[PDB]
Amino acid sequence: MGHHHHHHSHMSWYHRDLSRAAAEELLARAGRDGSFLVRDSESVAGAFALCVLYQKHVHTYRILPDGEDFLAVQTSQGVPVRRFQTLGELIGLYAQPNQGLVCALLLPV
């Protein structure tokens, strides 16, 4: 008896309005390792940031266009870096072990 299930049933890991304090805290409190989300960089040079939790260790990454239009993530130098046209490609690729990621991108929370 009753039918109540609204739409907009999405977490959305992309927030240009969260900040590292509440982003890293979102991962640490909600918790389930392989936790990731893409936040606003605090100015820097017009970049994006990716905060990832794994076993009491939050590593926060930057994600820069650079000086063209392509979104590169610096995991390491010797590691072959990939430039993405969308944040979706970023999340999908780094969901796989690369060499540099603390655990790879398992789930937002």
* Way the structure was solved: NMR
- Bridge partners, 51 (sequence order): 37, 60
Check: CB of residue 33 under 8 Å from CB of residue 54: yes
Distance CA 68, CA 71 (A): 9
Residue ranges of the alpha helices (H) in the chain? 20-30, 87-94
Report how many domains make up the chain. Answer: 1
Residue 23, φ and ψ in degrees, nearest 5: -75, -55
Check: CB of residue 34 under 8 Å from CB of residue 46: no
The CATH number covering residue 72 comes to: 3.30.505.10
- What is the span of the domain harbouring residue 44? 1-109
Check: CB of residue 87 under 8 Å from CB of residue 48: yes
- Closest alpha carbon to 61 in 50, 48, 46: 50
